[PDB]
Motif scaffolding. Structure first.
Motif, PDB file in Angstrom:
ATOM      1  N   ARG A  87       0.823  -1.203   0.000  1.00 30.36           N
ATOM      2  CA  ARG A  87       0.000   0.000   0.000  1.00 30.36           C
ATOM      3  C   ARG A  87       0.859   1.256   0.000  1.00 30.36           C
ATOM      4  O   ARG A  87       0.571   2.212  -0.730  1.00 30.36           O
ATOM      5  CB  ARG A  87      -0.928   0.009   1.209  1.00 30.36           C
ATOM      6  CG  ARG A  87      -1.910   1.143   1.190  1.00 30.36           C
ATOM      7  CD  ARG A  87      -2.761   1.145   2.446  1.00 30.36           C
ATOM      8  NE  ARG A  87      -2.003   1.503   3.654  1.00 30.36           N
ATOM      9  CZ  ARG A  87      -2.543   1.580   4.870  1.00 30.36           C
ATOM     10  NH1 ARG A  87      -3.843   1.319   5.037  1.00 30.36           N
ATOM     11  NH2 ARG A  87      -1.794   1.905   5.920  1.00 30.36           N
ATOM     12  N   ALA A  88       1.918   1.269   0.809  1.00 28.35           N
ATOM     13  CA  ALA A  88       2.829   2.403   0.816  1.00 28.35           C
ATOM     14  C   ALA A  88       3.293   2.714  -0.598  1.00 28.35           C
ATOM     15  O   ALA A  88       3.081   3.821  -1.107  1.00 28.35           O
ATOM     16  CB  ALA A  88       4.012   2.103   1.732  1.00 28.35           C
ATOM     17  N   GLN A  89       3.869   1.712  -1.271  1.00 26.11           N
ATOM     18  CA  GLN A  89       4.337   1.887  -2.643  1.00 26.11           C
ATOM     19  C   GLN A  89       3.236   2.408  -3.565  1.00 26.11           C
ATOM     20  O   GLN A  89       3.490   3.258  -4.426  1.00 26.11           O
ATOM     21  CB  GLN A  89       4.903   0.565  -3.173  1.00 26.11           C
ATOM     22  CG  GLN A  89       6.264   0.206  -2.603  1.00 26.11           C
ATOM     23  CD  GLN A  89       6.551  -1.283  -2.663  1.00 26.11           C
ATOM     24  OE1 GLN A  89       7.252  -1.751  -3.559  1.00 26.11           O
ATOM     25  NE2 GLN A  89       6.001  -2.042  -1.703  1.00 26.11           N
ATOM     26  N   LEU A  90       2.007   1.932  -3.400  1.00 28.95           N
ATOM     27  CA  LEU A  90       0.960   2.378  -4.313  1.00 28.95           C
ATOM     28  C   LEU A  90       0.537   3.801  -4.007  1.00 28.95           C
ATOM     29  O   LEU A  90       0.259   4.588  -4.923  1.00 28.95           O
ATOM     30  CB  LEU A  90      -0.246   1.438  -4.259  1.00 28.95           C
ATOM     31  CG  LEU A  90      -0.135   0.723  -5.594  1.00 28.95           C
ATOM     32  CD1 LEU A  90       0.748  -0.487  -5.470  1.00 28.95           C
ATOM     33  CD2 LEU A  90      -1.454   0.377  -6.108  1.00 28.95           C
ATOM     34  N   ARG A  91       0.459   4.137  -2.721  1.00 33.45           N
ATOM     35  CA  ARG A  91       0.215   5.514  -2.340  1.00 33.45           C
ATOM     36  C   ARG A  91       1.211   6.440  -3.026  1.00 33.45           C
ATOM     37  O   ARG A  91       0.821   7.411  -3.683  1.00 33.45           O
ATOM     38  CB  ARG A  91       0.272   5.641  -0.820  1.00 33.45           C
ATOM     39  CG  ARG A  91      -1.088   5.356  -0.188  1.00 33.45           C
ATOM     40  CD  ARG A  91      -1.034   5.192   1.330  1.00 33.45           C
ATOM     41  NE  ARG A  91      -2.353   4.877   1.872  1.00 33.45           N
ATOM     42  CZ  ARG A  91      -2.619   4.756   3.166  1.00 33.45           C
ATOM     43  NH1 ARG A  91      -1.648   4.929   4.049  1.00 33.45           N
ATOM     44  NH2 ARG A  91      -3.852   4.471   3.575  1.00 33.45           N
ATOM     45  N   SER A  92       2.506   6.114  -2.937  1.00 36.21           N
ATOM     46  CA  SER A  92       3.523   6.937  -3.577  1.00 36.21           C
ATOM     47  C   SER A  92       3.440   6.911  -5.099  1.00 36.21           C
ATOM     48  O   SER A  92       4.025   7.782  -5.746  1.00 36.21           O
ATOM     49  CB  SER A  92       4.926   6.500  -3.139  1.00 36.21           C
ATOM     50  OG  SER A  92       5.934   7.135  -3.925  1.00 36.21           O
ATOM     51  N   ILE A  93       2.767   5.940  -5.703  1.00 39.49           N
ATOM     52  CA  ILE A  93       2.685   5.961  -7.160  1.00 39.49           C
ATOM     53  C   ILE A  93       1.495   6.777  -7.621  1.00 39.49           C
ATOM     54  O   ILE A  93       1.582   7.512  -8.604  1.00 39.49           O
ATOM     55  CB  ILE A  93       2.643   4.533  -7.735  1.00 39.49           C
ATOM     56  CG1 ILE A  93       4.051   3.960  -7.787  1.00 39.49           C
ATOM     57  CG2 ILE A  93       2.024   4.528  -9.132  1.00 39.49           C
ATOM     58  CD1 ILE A  93       4.109   2.502  -7.502  1.00 39.49           C
ATOM     59  N   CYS A  94       0.382   6.684  -6.908  1.00 46.45           N
ATOM     60  CA  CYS A  94      -0.807   7.391  -7.341  1.00 46.45           C
ATOM     61  C   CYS A  94      -0.729   8.895  -7.066  1.00 46.45           C
ATOM     62  O   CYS A  94      -1.284   9.689  -7.839  1.00 46.45           O
ATOM     63  CB  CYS A  94      -2.021   6.759  -6.672  1.00 46.45           C
ATOM     64  SG  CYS A  94      -2.199   5.027  -7.144  1.00 46.45           S
ATOM     65  N   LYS A  95      -0.036   9.311  -5.993  1.00 47.81           N
ATOM     66  CA  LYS A  95      -0.080  10.717  -5.605  1.00 47.81           C
ATOM     67  C   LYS A  95       0.857  11.558  -6.460  1.00 47.81           C
ATOM     68  O   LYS A  95       0.586  12.736  -6.712  1.00 47.81           O
ATOM     69  CB  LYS A  95       0.250  10.875  -4.110  1.00 47.81           C
ATOM     70  CG  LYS A  95       1.716  10.718  -3.755  1.00 47.81           C
ATOM     71  CD  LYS A  95       1.967  10.692  -2.240  1.00 47.81           C
ATOM     72  CE  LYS A  95       3.472  10.799  -1.921  1.00 47.81           C
ATOM     73  NZ  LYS A  95       3.834  10.284  -0.561  1.00 47.81           N
ATOM     74  N   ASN A  96       1.948  10.967  -6.905  1.00 49.36           N
ATOM     75  CA  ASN A  96       2.870  11.601  -7.812  1.00 49.36           C
ATOM     76  C   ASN A  96       2.427  11.328  -9.248  1.00 49.36           C
ATOM     77  O   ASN A  96       1.372  10.743  -9.500  1.00 49.36           O
ATOM     78  CB  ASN A  96       4.284  11.086  -7.538  1.00 49.36           C
ATOM     79  CG  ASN A  96       4.744  11.366  -6.102  1.00 49.36           C
ATOM     80  OD1 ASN A  96       4.617  12.485  -5.594  1.00 49.36           O
ATOM     81  ND2 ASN A  96       5.283  10.345  -5.448  1.00 49.36           N
ATOM     82  N   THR A  97       3.229  11.793 -10.197  1.00 47.65           N
ATOM     83  CA  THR A  97       3.070  11.486 -11.608  1.00 47.65           C
ATOM     84  C   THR A  97       4.359  10.829 -12.066  1.00 47.65           C
ATOM     85  O   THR A  97       5.253  10.586 -11.262  1.00 47.65           O
ATOM     86  CB  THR A  97       2.747  12.737 -12.418  1.00 47.65           C
ATOM     87  OG1 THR A  97       2.340  12.343 -13.730  1.00 47.65           O
ATOM     88  CG2 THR A  97       3.989  13.625 -12.542  1.00 47.65           C
ATOM     89  N   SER A  98       4.467  10.580 -13.368  1.00 49.11           N
ATOM     90  CA  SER A  98       5.541   9.749 -13.898  1.00 49.11           C
ATOM     91  C   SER A  98       5.961  10.236 -15.289  1.00 49.11           C
ATOM     92  O   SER A  98       5.315  11.104 -15.894  1.00 49.11           O
ATOM     93  CB  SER A  98       5.083   8.290 -13.939  1.00 49.11           C
ATOM     94  OG  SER A  98       4.252   8.041 -15.069  1.00 49.11           O
ATOM     95  N   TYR A  99       7.044   9.647 -15.812  1.00 52.42           N
ATOM     96  CA  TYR A  99       7.405   9.833 -17.217  1.00 52.42           C
ATOM     97  C   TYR A  99       8.257   8.652 -17.668  1.00 52.42           C
ATOM     98  O   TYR A  99       8.888   7.978 -16.853  1.00 52.42           O
ATOM     99  CB  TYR A  99       8.152  11.157 -17.454  1.00 52.42           C
ATOM    100  CG  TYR A  99       9.626  11.099 -17.135  1.00 52.42           C
ATOM    101  CD1 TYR A  99      10.084  11.259 -15.835  1.00 52.42           C
ATOM    102  CD2 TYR A  99      10.565  10.876 -18.124  1.00 52.42           C
ATOM    103  CE1 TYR A  99      11.440  11.199 -15.528  1.00 52.42           C
ATOM    104  CE2 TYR A  99      11.920  10.814 -17.820  1.00 52.42           C
ATOM    105  CZ  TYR A  99      12.351  10.980 -16.518  1.00 52.42           C
ATOM    106  OH  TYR A  99      13.701  10.949 -16.205  1.00 52.42           O
TER     107      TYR A  99
END
Length: 233
Positions: free
Chosen positions: A154-166
């Motif tokens: 869950r921690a990892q997913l929280r950090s993936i959804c709240k930020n963006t990516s490239y």
């Protein structure tokens, strides 16, 4: 200023044009002086949104691909209060290779980093992130190792959804999702865009940030169906 005017015109265009219903994600397009000079990698790099957050895990339909057999991770994550509704589907990489668009039912796909190289188009959100099912080292109560640590996931997913990516490339330009129509106000979007720009041009944050080469020629803002409005020239 100009940039605020651009978003206000894109938000309006999403309310006036009937084509722009089911347009949701807002992306900026950054055109750079040189090619980014990175051999294409196809793994999302995280870009940290500071003030606000893109999404929360409970927002999206998330697909988890795990080491085969997946039964153990599926059962643990599903029967844990912190992660029960976290994923939409948990399947093995073999289950996925046998299905092979392919993720058109998911807003996000995360894979066990161990099976990432076993997975089978440029402009695609659904490119898989890497996560860990278990901490490489837990200091608390070492007499026990968790093969699947639902809080850590869950921690990892929280950090993936709240930020963006490239997705790094050897390309002249680079697209990055910066907001969701209606879910973010004009200031939250704009703050996300500056965070994107500050990170992507900060040489101290190498190797993930500070990747833009040759300066920024322009930045446009866009939804899938809308016009490409200049944010900065």
């Amino acid at each position: 200023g100009l940039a605020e005017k651009a978003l206000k015109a894109l938000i309006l265009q999403c309310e006036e044009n009937p084509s722009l219903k089911n347009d949701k994600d807002i992306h900026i397009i950054i055109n750079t002086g040189k090619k980014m000079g990175i051999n294409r990698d196809n793994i999302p790099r995280i870009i940290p949104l500071t003030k606000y957050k893109l999404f929360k895990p409970r927002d999206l339909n998330i697909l988890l691909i795990t080491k085969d057999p997946s039964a153990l991770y599926r059962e643990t994550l599903t029967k844990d209060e912190h992660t029960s509704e976290l994923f939409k589907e948990i399947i093995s990489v073999k289950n996925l290779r046998r299905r092979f668009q392919l993720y058109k039912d998911f807003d996000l796909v995360v894979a066990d980093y161990r099976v990432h190289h076993l997975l089978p188009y440029h402009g695609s959100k659904k490119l898989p992130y890497m996560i860990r099912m278990s901490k490489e080292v837990k200091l608390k109560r070492q007499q026990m190792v968790e093969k699947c640590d639902p809080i850590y996931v869950r921690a990892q997913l929280r950090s993936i959804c709240k930020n963006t990516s490239y997705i790094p490339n050897n390309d002249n330009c680079l697209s990055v999702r910066v907001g969701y129509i209606q879910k973010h106000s004009i200031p939250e979007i704009l703050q996300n865009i500056q965070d994107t720009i500050n990170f992507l041009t900060d040489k101290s944050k190498r190797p993930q940030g500070g990747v833009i080469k040759g300066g920024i020629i322009s930045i446009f803002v866009k939804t899938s169906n809308s016009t490409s409005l200049p944010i900065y020239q």
